[PDB]
Amino acid sequence: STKAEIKAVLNQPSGKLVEVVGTIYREGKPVMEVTSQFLYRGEYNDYCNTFQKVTETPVQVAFKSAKDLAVLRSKEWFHLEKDVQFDVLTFRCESTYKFKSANVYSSIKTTGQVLLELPTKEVIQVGSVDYEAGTSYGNPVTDYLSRNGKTIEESVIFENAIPLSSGEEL
Amino acid sequence: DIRRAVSIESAIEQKVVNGDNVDANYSKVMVEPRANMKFDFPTLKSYDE
Protein backbone atom coordinates (compact mmCIF):
# COMPACT_ATOMS: atom_id res chain seq x y z
CA SER A 1 0.00 0.00 0.00
CA THR A 2 0.97 3.65 -0.21
CA LYS A 3 0.64 6.67 2.06
CA ALA A 4 1.91 10.08 1.00
CA GLU A 5 1.70 13.53 2.54
CA ILE A 6 2.43 16.92 1.03
CA LYS A 7 5.19 18.98 2.61
CA ALA A 8 6.18 22.06 0.63
CA VAL A 9 3.88 24.54 -1.11
CA LEU A 10 5.77 27.78 -1.60
CA ASN A 11 5.42 30.57 -4.14
CA GLN A 12 8.91 30.77 -5.56
CA PRO A 13 9.75 33.53 -8.04
CA SER A 14 9.50 30.89 -10.76
CA GLY A 15 6.11 29.50 -9.76
CA LYS A 16 4.38 27.30 -7.21
CA LEU A 17 6.66 24.49 -6.06
CA VAL A 18 5.04 21.39 -4.62
CA GLU A 19 6.95 18.64 -2.81
CA VAL A 20 5.35 15.35 -1.80
CA VAL A 21 6.89 12.48 0.13
CA GLY A 22 5.43 9.01 -0.20
CA THR A 23 5.92 6.51 2.59
CA ILE A 24 5.17 3.21 0.88
CA TYR A 25 3.99 0.41 3.15
CA ARG A 26 4.24 -3.36 3.21
CA GLU A 27 1.95 -5.14 5.67
CA GLY A 28 1.91 -1.90 7.64
CA LYS A 29 5.59 -1.54 7.92
CA PRO A 30 6.91 1.36 5.84
CA VAL A 31 9.51 0.24 3.34
CA MET A 32 10.82 3.26 1.48
CA GLU A 33 10.18 6.95 1.01
CA VAL A 34 9.82 8.68 -2.33
CA THR A 35 10.21 12.45 -2.45
CA SER A 36 8.93 14.07 -5.62
CA GLN A 37 9.07 17.72 -6.58
CA PHE A 38 6.81 19.45 -9.08
CA LEU A 39 6.43 23.07 -10.09
CA TYR A 40 3.40 25.00 -11.30
CA ARG A 41 5.56 27.25 -13.46
CA GLY A 42 4.45 30.84 -13.78
CA GLU A 43 3.55 33.42 -11.17
CA TYR A 44 1.39 33.11 -8.07
CA ASN A 45 0.82 35.47 -5.14
CA ASP A 46 -1.47 33.24 -3.06
CA TYR A 47 0.67 33.75 -0.01
CA CYS A 48 -2.20 32.52 2.16
CA ASN A 49 -2.41 28.89 1.02
CA THR A 50 1.35 28.46 0.97
CA PHE A 51 3.26 26.72 3.74
CA GLN A 52 6.15 24.40 4.50
CA LYS A 53 6.93 21.61 6.97
CA VAL A 54 10.60 20.78 7.43
CA THR A 55 12.45 18.62 9.92
CA GLU A 56 15.63 20.26 11.13
CA THR A 57 19.10 18.82 10.93
CA PRO A 58 19.86 17.32 14.36
CA VAL A 59 22.25 19.86 15.89
CA GLN A 60 24.70 19.01 18.66
CA VAL A 61 25.30 21.94 21.02
CA ALA A 62 28.04 21.54 23.62
CA PHE A 63 27.74 23.29 26.97
CA LYS A 64 31.06 24.04 28.66
CA SER A 65 30.78 27.30 30.61
CA ALA A 66 28.06 28.10 33.15
CA LYS A 67 26.40 30.91 31.19
CA ASP A 68 25.54 28.54 28.35
CA LEU A 69 23.26 26.49 30.57
CA ALA A 70 21.62 29.74 31.63
CA VAL A 71 21.76 31.12 28.09
CA LEU A 72 19.28 28.62 26.72
CA ARG A 73 17.37 28.33 29.98
CA SER A 74 16.56 31.99 29.41
CA LYS A 75 15.04 31.03 26.06
CA GLU A 76 11.31 30.85 26.70
CA TRP A 77 11.08 28.57 23.69
CA PHE A 78 13.46 26.16 25.40
CA HIS A 79 11.74 24.14 28.08
CA LEU A 80 13.50 21.34 29.94
CA GLU A 81 11.45 18.84 31.92
CA LYS A 82 14.27 16.96 33.67
CA ASP A 83 16.60 18.61 36.17
CA VAL A 84 19.70 16.60 35.32
CA GLN A 85 23.11 18.06 34.60
CA PHE A 86 24.19 17.85 30.97
CA ASP A 87 27.42 18.46 29.09
CA VAL A 88 26.46 18.17 25.41
CA LEU A 89 22.95 18.20 23.97
CA THR A 90 21.63 17.05 20.61
CA PHE A 91 18.65 18.97 19.27
CA ARG A 92 16.35 17.06 16.93
CA CYS A 93 13.68 19.50 15.82
CA GLU A 94 11.09 20.12 13.13
CA SER A 95 9.27 23.26 12.06
CA THR A 96 6.09 24.36 10.34
CA TYR A 97 6.28 27.60 8.38
CA LYS A 98 3.36 29.62 7.13
CA PHE A 99 4.27 32.50 4.86
CA LYS A 100 2.63 35.89 4.53
CA SER A 101 4.79 37.40 1.78
CA ALA A 102 7.96 36.52 -0.09
CA ASN A 103 9.95 36.34 3.14
CA VAL A 104 7.75 37.15 6.12
CA TYR A 105 6.46 34.11 7.98
CA SER A 106 2.87 34.54 9.07
CA SER A 107 3.48 31.75 11.59
CA ILE A 108 6.24 29.46 12.83
CA LYS A 109 5.55 26.40 14.98
CA THR A 110 8.86 24.65 15.60
CA THR A 111 8.67 21.79 18.07
CA GLY A 112 11.52 19.41 18.72
CA GLN A 113 13.30 17.33 21.29
CA VAL A 114 16.55 17.92 23.11
CA LEU A 115 18.52 14.79 23.86
CA LEU A 116 21.34 13.93 26.24
CA GLU A 117 24.00 11.30 25.62
CA LEU A 118 24.74 9.37 28.80
CA PRO A 119 27.94 7.38 29.34
CA THR A 120 25.69 4.30 29.42
CA LYS A 121 25.02 5.16 25.75
CA GLU A 122 21.37 5.52 26.74
CA VAL A 123 19.87 8.72 25.37
CA ILE A 124 17.22 10.41 27.51
CA GLN A 125 15.28 13.48 26.44
CA VAL A 126 16.01 16.38 28.76
CA GLY A 127 13.11 18.49 27.56
CA SER A 128 11.25 19.95 24.62
CA VAL A 129 11.58 22.95 22.35
CA ASP A 130 8.41 24.96 21.76
CA TYR A 131 8.72 28.11 19.67
CA GLU A 132 5.68 29.90 18.29
CA ALA A 133 5.44 33.32 16.68
CA GLY A 134 3.93 35.30 13.84
CA THR A 135 5.30 37.69 11.23
CA SER A 136 8.89 36.67 11.77
CA TYR A 137 11.94 36.72 9.52
CA GLY A 138 13.60 33.48 10.58
CA ASN A 139 13.39 30.55 12.91
CA PRO A 140 15.26 31.68 16.02
CA VAL A 141 15.74 28.15 17.29
CA THR A 142 17.46 27.07 14.09
CA ASP A 143 19.67 30.15 13.99
CA TYR A 144 20.67 29.74 17.62
CA LEU A 145 21.47 26.10 16.93
CA SER A 146 23.56 27.02 13.90
CA ARG A 147 25.94 29.62 15.33
CA ASN A 148 26.21 28.15 18.83
CA GLY A 149 26.37 24.48 17.90
CA LYS A 150 27.34 22.07 15.17
CA THR A 151 24.95 19.66 13.52
CA ILE A 152 25.09 15.89 13.66
CA GLU A 153 26.01 15.74 9.98
CA GLU A 154 25.88 12.45 8.10
CA SER A 155 27.06 13.28 4.57
CA VAL A 156 30.78 13.46 5.27
CA ILE A 157 32.47 14.67 2.10
CA PHE A 158 35.86 13.79 0.72
CA GLU A 159 38.19 16.68 0.07
CA ASN A 160 38.69 15.26 -3.44
CA ALA A 161 36.01 13.22 -5.17
CA ILE A 162 36.99 10.15 -7.17
CA PRO A 163 35.68 9.20 -10.64
CA LEU A 164 34.21 5.73 -10.64
CA SER A 165 34.69 4.86 -14.31
CA SER A 166 36.45 6.85 -17.01
CA GLY A 167 35.66 6.82 -20.72
CA GLU A 168 32.41 6.85 -22.66
CA GLU A 169 31.00 3.46 -21.65
CA LEU A 170 28.36 5.32 -19.60
CA ASP B 1 29.42 37.49 31.80
CA ILE B 2 26.02 35.81 31.94
CA ARG B 3 24.20 39.12 31.99
CA ARG B 4 26.35 40.04 29.01
CA ALA B 5 25.82 36.84 27.03
CA VAL B 6 22.09 36.51 27.71
CA SER B 7 21.71 40.12 26.62
CA ILE B 8 23.64 39.40 23.42
CA GLU B 9 21.52 36.32 22.74
CA SER B 10 18.20 38.09 23.27
CA ALA B 11 19.44 40.98 21.15
CA ILE B 12 20.31 38.73 18.22
CA GLU B 13 17.14 36.68 18.68
CA GLN B 14 15.12 39.87 18.28
CA LYS B 15 17.32 40.95 15.37
CA VAL B 16 16.36 37.70 13.65
CA VAL B 17 12.65 37.63 14.48
CA ASN B 18 12.00 41.34 13.95
CA GLY B 19 14.53 41.25 11.15
CA ASP B 20 17.66 43.35 10.83
CA ASN B 21 15.75 46.12 9.04
CA VAL B 22 14.02 47.75 12.02
CA ASP B 23 16.67 47.15 14.70
CA ALA B 24 18.85 49.83 13.08
CA ASN B 25 15.90 52.19 13.59
CA TYR B 26 16.01 51.53 17.34
CA SER B 27 19.52 52.93 17.46
CA LYS B 28 18.90 56.66 17.48
CA VAL B 29 20.47 58.71 14.71
CA MET B 30 22.98 60.65 16.78
CA VAL B 31 24.25 64.04 15.66
CA GLU B 32 27.84 64.48 14.57
CA PRO B 33 29.29 67.83 15.67
CA ARG B 34 31.04 70.33 13.41
CA ALA B 35 33.24 73.31 14.13
CA ASN B 36 31.54 76.69 14.13
CA MET B 37 34.36 79.15 13.58
CA LYS B 38 32.68 82.52 13.70
CA PHE B 39 34.45 85.79 13.94
CA ASP B 40 32.38 87.30 16.71
CA PHE B 41 33.29 90.94 17.15
CA PRO B 42 33.34 91.79 20.87
CA THR B 43 29.80 91.66 22.18
CA LEU B 44 28.09 95.04 22.37
CA LYS B 45 26.13 95.64 25.52
CA SER B 46 22.98 97.69 25.30
CA TYR B 47 23.16 101.44 25.66
CA ASP B 48 21.14 101.90 28.84
CA GLU B 49 23.11 98.97 30.19
Side-chain angles (χ1 to χ4, degrees), chain A residues 67 71 74-75 131 135-138 140 143-144 147-148, chain B residues 1-2 5-6 8-10 12-13 16-19 21:
Chain A
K67 51 190 185 170
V71 162
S74 54
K75 299 301 188 296
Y131 183 87
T135 318
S136 300
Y137 288 61
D143 199 338
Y144 156 70
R147 43 167 167 159
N148 308 107
Chain B
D1 71 330
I2 74 180
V6 170
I8 297 319
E9 293 304 316
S10 278
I12 303 172
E13 183 272 344
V16 163
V17 184
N18 186 54
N21 52 3

PDB file of all heavy atoms in Angstrom, chain A residues 67 71 74-75 131 135-138 140 143-144 147-148, chain B residues 1-2 5-6 8-10 12-13 16-19 21:
ATOM      1  N   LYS A  67      27.382  30.048  31.832  1.00  0.00           N
ATOM      2  CA  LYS A  67      26.397  30.906  31.194  1.00  0.00           C
ATOM      3  C   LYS A  67      25.588  30.167  30.146  1.00  0.00           C
ATOM      4  O   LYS A  67      24.381  30.407  30.033  1.00  0.00           O
ATOM      5  CB  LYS A  67      27.086  32.106  30.547  1.00  0.00           C
ATOM      6  CG  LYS A  67      28.239  31.744  29.658  1.00  0.00           C
ATOM      7  CD  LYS A  67      29.009  32.970  29.251  1.00  0.00           C
ATOM      8  CE  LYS A  67      30.089  32.618  28.255  1.00  0.00           C
ATOM      9  NZ  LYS A  67      30.693  33.846  27.678  1.00  0.00           N
ATOM     10  N   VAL A  71      22.099  30.483  29.355  1.00  0.00           N
ATOM     11  CA  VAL A  71      21.764  31.118  28.088  1.00  0.00           C
ATOM     12  C   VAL A  71      20.488  30.521  27.521  1.00  0.00           C
ATOM     13  O   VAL A  71      19.492  31.224  27.322  1.00  0.00           O
ATOM     14  CB  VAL A  71      22.932  30.997  27.097  1.00  0.00           C
ATOM     15  CG1 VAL A  71      22.443  31.243  25.694  1.00  0.00           C
ATOM     16  CG2 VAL A  71      24.013  31.991  27.438  1.00  0.00           C
ATOM     17  N   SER A  74      17.268  30.733  29.595  1.00  0.00           N
ATOM     18  CA  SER A  74      16.561  31.987  29.415  1.00  0.00           C
ATOM     19  C   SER A  74      15.594  31.921  28.244  1.00  0.00           C
ATOM     20  O   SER A  74      14.574  32.616  28.251  1.00  0.00           O
ATOM     21  CB  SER A  74      17.561  33.115  29.201  1.00  0.00           C
ATOM     22  OG  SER A  74      18.432  32.800  28.133  1.00  0.00           O
ATOM     23  N   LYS A  75      15.888  31.096  27.245  1.00  0.00           N
ATOM     24  CA  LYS A  75      15.041  31.035  26.063  1.00  0.00           C
ATOM     25  C   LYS A  75      13.690  30.444  26.408  1.00  0.00           C
ATOM     26  O   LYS A  75      13.570  29.239  26.647  1.00  0.00           O
ATOM     27  CB  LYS A  75      15.714  30.211  24.975  1.00  0.00           C
ATOM     28  CG  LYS A  75      17.021  30.789  24.518  1.00  0.00           C
ATOM     29  CD  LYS A  75      16.809  32.186  23.982  1.00  0.00           C
ATOM     30  CE  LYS A  75      18.075  32.711  23.352  1.00  0.00           C
ATOM     31  NZ  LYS A  75      19.148  32.849  24.366  1.00  0.00           N
ATOM     32  N   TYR A 131       8.752  26.745  20.157  1.00  0.00           N
ATOM     33  CA  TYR A 131       8.720  28.110  19.666  1.00  0.00           C
ATOM     34  C   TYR A 131       7.412  28.337  18.931  1.00  0.00           C
ATOM     35  O   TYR A 131       6.855  27.408  18.341  1.00  0.00           O
ATOM     36  CB  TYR A 131       9.893  28.399  18.737  1.00  0.00           C
ATOM     37  CG  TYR A 131       9.919  29.825  18.265  1.00  0.00           C
ATOM     38  CD1 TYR A 131      10.554  30.802  19.005  1.00  0.00           C
ATOM     39  CD2 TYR A 131       9.300  30.197  17.089  1.00  0.00           C
ATOM     40  CE1 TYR A 131      10.573  32.103  18.584  1.00  0.00           C
ATOM     41  CE2 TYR A 131       9.317  31.494  16.661  1.00  0.00           C
ATOM     42  CZ  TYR A 131       9.956  32.442  17.411  1.00  0.00           C
ATOM     43  OH  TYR A 131       9.978  33.744  16.981  1.00  0.00           O
ATOM     44  N   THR A 135       4.663  36.593  11.959  1.00  0.00           N
ATOM     45  CA  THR A 135       5.300  37.689  11.233  1.00  0.00           C
ATOM     46  C   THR A 135       6.767  37.826  11.646  1.00  0.00           C
ATOM     47  O   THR A 135       7.224  38.851  12.145  1.00  0.00           O
ATOM     48  CB  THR A 135       4.537  38.996  11.451  1.00  0.00           C
ATOM     49  OG1 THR A 135       3.132  38.736  11.382  1.00  0.00           O
ATOM     50  CG2 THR A 135       4.902  40.001  10.372  1.00  0.00           C
ATOM     51  N   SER A 136       7.490  36.749  11.423  1.00  0.00           N
ATOM     52  CA  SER A 136       8.894  36.671  11.766  1.00  0.00           C
ATOM     53  C   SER A 136       9.717  36.599  10.491  1.00  0.00           C
ATOM     54  O   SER A 136       9.193  36.427   9.391  1.00  0.00           O
ATOM     55  CB  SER A 136       9.148  35.463  12.661  1.00  0.00           C
ATOM     56  OG  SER A 136       8.390  35.567  13.851  1.00  0.00           O
ATOM     57  N   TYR A 137      11.027  36.725  10.647  1.00  0.00           N
ATOM     58  CA  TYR A 137      11.935  36.721   9.516  1.00  0.00           C
ATOM     59  C   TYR A 137      12.912  35.564   9.563  1.00  0.00           C
ATOM     60  O   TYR A 137      13.844  35.521   8.753  1.00  0.00           O
ATOM     61  CB  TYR A 137      12.706  38.040   9.448  1.00  0.00           C
ATOM     62  CG  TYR A 137      11.863  39.202   9.006  1.00  0.00           C
ATOM     63  CD1 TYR A 137      10.755  39.597   9.738  1.00  0.00           C
ATOM     64  CD2 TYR A 137      12.167  39.901   7.854  1.00  0.00           C
ATOM     65  CE1 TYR A 137       9.980  40.651   9.341  1.00  0.00           C
ATOM     66  CE2 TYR A 137      11.400  40.961   7.448  1.00  0.00           C
ATOM     67  CZ  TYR A 137      10.305  41.332   8.195  1.00  0.00           C
ATOM     68  OH  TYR A 137       9.529  42.392   7.795  1.00  0.00           O
ATOM     69  N   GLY A 138      12.741  34.643  10.497  1.00  0.00           N
ATOM     70  CA  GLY A 138      13.604  33.484  10.583  1.00  0.00           C
ATOM     71  C   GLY A 138      13.211  32.670  11.789  1.00  0.00           C
ATOM     72  O   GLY A 138      12.523  33.148  12.694  1.00  0.00           O
ATOM     73  N   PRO A 140      14.190  31.380  15.076  1.00  0.00           N
ATOM     74  CA  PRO A 140      15.263  31.677  16.025  1.00  0.00           C
ATOM     75  C   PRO A 140      15.924  30.432  16.545  1.00  0.00           C
ATOM     76  O   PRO A 140      17.140  30.433  16.756  1.00  0.00           O
ATOM     77  CB  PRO A 140      14.546  32.439  17.148  1.00  0.00           C
ATOM     78  CG  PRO A 140      13.194  32.736  16.625  1.00  0.00           C
ATOM     79  CD  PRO A 140      12.871  31.687  15.638  1.00  0.00           C
ATOM     80  N   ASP A 143      18.514  29.264  13.994  1.00  0.00           N
ATOM     81  CA  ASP A 143      19.666  30.150  13.987  1.00  0.00           C
ATOM     82  C   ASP A 143      20.530  29.938  15.214  1.00  0.00           C
ATOM     83  O   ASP A 143      21.747  29.770  15.094  1.00  0.00           O
ATOM     84  CB  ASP A 143      19.213  31.601  13.914  1.00  0.00           C
ATOM     85  CG  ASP A 143      20.312  32.520  13.446  1.00  0.00           C
ATOM     86  OD1 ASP A 143      21.495  32.143  13.565  1.00  0.00           O
ATOM     87  OD2 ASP A 143      19.996  33.619  12.948  1.00  0.00           O
ATOM     88  N   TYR A 144      19.915  29.918  16.391  1.00  0.00           N
ATOM     89  CA  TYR A 144      20.672  29.736  17.619  1.00  0.00           C
ATOM     90  C   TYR A 144      21.400  28.403  17.617  1.00  0.00           C
ATOM     91  O   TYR A 144      22.536  28.310  18.095  1.00  0.00           O
ATOM     92  CB  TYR A 144      19.737  29.843  18.817  1.00  0.00           C
ATOM     93  CG  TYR A 144      20.246  29.143  20.040  1.00  0.00           C
ATOM     94  CD1 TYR A 144      21.338  29.632  20.734  1.00  0.00           C
ATOM     95  CD2 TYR A 144      19.631  27.999  20.512  1.00  0.00           C
ATOM     96  CE1 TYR A 144      21.808  28.998  21.853  1.00  0.00           C
ATOM     97  CE2 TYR A 144      20.090  27.359  21.634  1.00  0.00           C
ATOM     98  CZ  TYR A 144      21.181  27.864  22.300  1.00  0.00           C
ATOM     99  OH  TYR A 144      21.647  27.230  23.423  1.00  0.00           O
ATOM    100  N   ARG A 147      24.754  28.883  14.917  1.00  0.00           N
ATOM    101  CA  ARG A 147      25.938  29.617  15.328  1.00  0.00           C
ATOM    102  C   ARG A 147      26.550  29.098  16.612  1.00  0.00           C
ATOM    103  O   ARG A 147      27.765  29.184  16.778  1.00  0.00           O
ATOM    104  CB  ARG A 147      25.599  31.095  15.518  1.00  0.00           C
ATOM    105  CG  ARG A 147      24.289  31.284  16.236  1.00  0.00           C
ATOM    106  CD  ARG A 147      24.090  32.701  16.697  1.00  0.00           C
ATOM    107  NE  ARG A 147      22.708  32.922  17.100  1.00  0.00           N
ATOM    108  CZ  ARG A 147      22.318  33.904  17.901  1.00  0.00           C
ATOM    109  NH1 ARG A 147      23.212  34.749  18.389  1.00  0.00           N
ATOM    110  NH2 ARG A 147      21.039  34.037  18.220  1.00  0.00           N
ATOM    111  N   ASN A 148      25.739  28.563  17.517  1.00  0.00           N
ATOM    112  CA  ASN A 148      26.206  28.147  18.828  1.00  0.00           C
ATOM    113  C   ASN A 148      26.393  26.643  18.937  1.00  0.00           C
ATOM    114  O   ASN A 148      26.727  26.147  20.015  1.00  0.00           O
ATOM    115  CB  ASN A 148      25.233  28.638  19.896  1.00  0.00           C
ATOM    116  CG  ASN A 148      24.960  30.119  19.783  1.00  0.00           C
ATOM    117  OD1 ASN A 148      23.885  30.534  19.359  1.00  0.00           O
ATOM    118  ND2 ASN A 148      25.943  30.927  20.152  1.00  0.00           N
TER     119      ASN A 148
ATOM    120  N   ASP B   1      29.392  38.143  33.099  1.00  0.00           N
ATOM    121  CA  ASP B   1      29.421  37.485  31.805  1.00  0.00           C
ATOM    122  C   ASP B   1      28.075  36.907  31.409  1.00  0.00           C
ATOM    123  O   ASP B   1      27.730  36.947  30.229  1.00  0.00           O
ATOM    124  CB  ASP B   1      30.466  36.373  31.790  1.00  0.00           C
ATOM    125  CG  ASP B   1      30.056  35.196  32.628  1.00  0.00           C
ATOM    126  OD1 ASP B   1      29.329  35.414  33.614  1.00  0.00           O
ATOM    127  OD2 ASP B   1      30.438  34.057  32.290  1.00  0.00           O
ATOM    128  N   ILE B   2      27.303  36.361  32.351  1.00  0.00           N
ATOM    129  CA  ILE B   2      26.022  35.808  31.939  1.00  0.00           C
ATOM    130  C   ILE B   2      25.051  36.922  31.606  1.00  0.00           C
ATOM    131  O   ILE B   2      24.289  36.812  30.643  1.00  0.00           O
ATOM    132  CB  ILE B   2      25.434  34.846  32.987  1.00  0.00           C
ATOM    133  CG1 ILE B   2      24.894  35.591  34.200  1.00  0.00           C
ATOM    134  CG2 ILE B   2      26.457  33.829  33.408  1.00  0.00           C
ATOM    135  CD1 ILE B   2      24.313  34.676  35.240  1.00  0.00           C
ATOM    136  N   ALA B   5      26.099  37.806  28.087  1.00  0.00           N
ATOM    137  CA  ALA B   5      25.817  36.845  27.033  1.00  0.00           C
ATOM    138  C   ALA B   5      24.327  36.670  26.809  1.00  0.00           C
ATOM    139  O   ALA B   5      23.892  36.565  25.661  1.00  0.00           O
ATOM    140  CB  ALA B   5      26.465  35.501  27.358  1.00  0.00           C
ATOM    141  N   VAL B   6      23.530  36.625  27.875  1.00  0.00           N
ATOM    142  CA  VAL B   6      22.088  36.509  27.708  1.00  0.00           C
ATOM    143  C   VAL B   6      21.538  37.741  27.007  1.00  0.00           C
ATOM    144  O   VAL B   6      20.650  37.647  26.153  1.00  0.00           O
ATOM    145  CB  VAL B   6      21.410  36.281  29.068  1.00  0.00           C
ATOM    146  CG1 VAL B   6      19.909  36.406  28.938  1.00  0.00           C
ATOM    147  CG2 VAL B   6      21.775  34.919  29.598  1.00  0.00           C
ATOM    148  N   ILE B   8      23.257  39.548  24.818  1.00  0.00           N
ATOM    149  CA  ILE B   8      23.640  39.396  23.420  1.00  0.00           C
ATOM    150  C   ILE B   8      22.697  38.442  22.705  1.00  0.00           C
ATOM    151  O   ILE B   8      22.253  38.699  21.579  1.00  0.00           O
ATOM    152  CB  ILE B   8      25.097  38.914  23.323  1.00  0.00           C
ATOM    153  CG1 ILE B   8      26.040  39.958  23.910  1.00  0.00           C
ATOM    154  CG2 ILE B   8      25.456  38.629  21.886  1.00  0.00           C
ATOM    155  CD1 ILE B   8      25.677  41.375  23.547  1.00  0.00           C
ATOM    156  N   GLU B   9      22.384  37.322  23.353  1.00  0.00           N
ATOM    157  CA  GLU B   9      21.520  36.325  22.742  1.00  0.00           C
ATOM    158  C   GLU B   9      20.129  36.870  22.490  1.00  0.00           C
ATOM    159  O   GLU B   9      19.589  36.683  21.399  1.00  0.00           O
ATOM    160  CB  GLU B   9      21.441  35.084  23.622  1.00  0.00           C
ATOM    161  CG  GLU B   9      22.746  34.343  23.723  1.00  0.00           C
ATOM    162  CD  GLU B   9      23.282  33.950  22.371  1.00  0.00           C
ATOM    163  OE1 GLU B   9      22.488  33.479  21.534  1.00  0.00           O
ATOM    164  OE2 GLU B   9      24.496  34.123  22.141  1.00  0.00           O
ATOM    165  N   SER B  10      19.532  37.533  23.477  1.00  0.00           N
ATOM    166  CA  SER B  10      18.202  38.086  23.273  1.00  0.00           C
ATOM    167  C   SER B  10      18.214  39.260  22.310  1.00  0.00           C
ATOM    168  O   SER B  10      17.190  39.541  21.682  1.00  0.00           O
ATOM    169  CB  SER B  10      17.594  38.503  24.609  1.00  0.00           C
ATOM    170  OG  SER B  10      17.033  37.384  25.268  1.00  0.00           O
ATOM    171  N   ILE B  12      20.233  39.322  19.549  1.00  0.00           N
ATOM    172  CA  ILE B  12      20.308  38.727  18.222  1.00  0.00           C
ATOM    173  C   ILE B  12      19.044  37.947  17.894  1.00  0.00           C
ATOM    174  O   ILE B  12      18.615  37.911  16.737  1.00  0.00           O
ATOM    175  CB  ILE B  12      21.561  37.850  18.109  1.00  0.00           C
ATOM    176  CG1 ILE B  12      22.795  38.694  18.418  1.00  0.00           C
ATOM    177  CG2 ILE B  12      21.666  37.253  16.724  1.00  0.00           C
ATOM    178  CD1 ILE B  12      24.064  37.898  18.527  1.00  0.00           C
ATOM    179  N   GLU B  13      18.424  37.322  18.889  1.00  0.00           N
ATOM    180  CA  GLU B  13      17.138  36.683  18.680  1.00  0.00           C
ATOM    181  C   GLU B  13      16.099  37.667  18.172  1.00  0.00           C
ATOM    182  O   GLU B  13      15.403  37.372  17.195  1.00  0.00           O
ATOM    183  CB  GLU B  13      16.676  36.039  19.983  1.00  0.00           C
ATOM    184  CG  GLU B  13      15.380  35.271  19.901  1.00  0.00           C
ATOM    185  CD  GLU B  13      14.178  36.150  20.156  1.00  0.00           C
ATOM    186  OE1 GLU B  13      14.363  37.262  20.690  1.00  0.00           O
ATOM    187  OE2 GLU B  13      13.048  35.728  19.839  1.00  0.00           O
ATOM    188  N   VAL B  16      16.802  38.684  14.630  1.00  0.00           N
ATOM    189  CA  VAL B  16      16.360  37.699  13.651  1.00  0.00           C
ATOM    190  C   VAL B  16      14.852  37.765  13.473  1.00  0.00           C
ATOM    191  O   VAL B  16      14.352  37.909  12.353  1.00  0.00           O
ATOM    192  CB  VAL B  16      16.815  36.292  14.064  1.00  0.00           C
ATOM    193  CG1 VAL B  16      16.025  35.249  13.313  1.00  0.00           C
ATOM    194  CG2 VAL B  16      18.287  36.134  13.788  1.00  0.00           C
ATOM    195  N   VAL B  17      14.105  37.671  14.574  1.00  0.00           N
ATOM    196  CA  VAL B  17      12.649  37.634  14.475  1.00  0.00           C
ATOM    197  C   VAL B  17      12.123  38.911  13.839  1.00  0.00           C
ATOM    198  O   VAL B  17      11.519  38.888  12.763  1.00  0.00           O
ATOM    199  CB  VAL B  17      12.020  37.405  15.857  1.00  0.00           C
ATOM    200  CG1 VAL B  17      10.520  37.277  15.728  1.00  0.00           C
ATOM    201  CG2 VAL B  17      12.590  36.171  16.484  1.00  0.00           C
ATOM    202  N   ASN B  18      12.347  40.041  14.494  1.00  0.00           N
ATOM    203  CA  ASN B  18      11.997  41.341  13.954  1.00  0.00           C
ATOM    204  C   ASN B  18      12.758  41.674  12.681  1.00  0.00           C
ATOM    205  O   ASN B  18      12.394  42.629  11.988  1.00  0.00           O
ATOM    206  CB  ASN B  18      12.260  42.419  15.009  1.00  0.00           C
ATOM    207  CG  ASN B  18      11.788  43.787  14.578  1.00  0.00           C
ATOM    208  OD1 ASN B  18      10.629  43.970  14.211  1.00  0.00           O
ATOM    209  ND2 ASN B  18      12.687  44.761  14.621  1.00  0.00           N
ATOM    210  N   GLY B  19      13.786  40.916  12.350  1.00  0.00           N
ATOM    211  CA  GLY B  19      14.534  41.248  11.154  1.00  0.00           C
ATOM    212  C   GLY B  19      15.494  42.395  11.386  1.00  0.00           C
ATOM    213  O   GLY B  19      15.255  43.298  12.185  1.00  0.00           O
ATOM    214  N   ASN B  21      16.097  44.897   9.752  1.00  0.00           N
ATOM    215  CA  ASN B  21      15.748  46.115   9.037  1.00  0.00           C
ATOM    216  C   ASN B  21      15.146  47.175   9.948  1.00  0.00           C
ATOM    217  O   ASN B  21      15.176  48.362   9.608  1.00  0.00           O
ATOM    218  CB  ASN B  21      14.788  45.780   7.898  1.00  0.00           C
ATOM    219  CG  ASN B  21      13.591  44.981   8.369  1.00  0.00           C
ATOM    220  OD1 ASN B  21      13.436  44.718   9.561  1.00  0.00           O
ATOM    221  ND2 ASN B  21      12.737  44.586   7.433  1.00  0.00           N
TER     222      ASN B  21
END
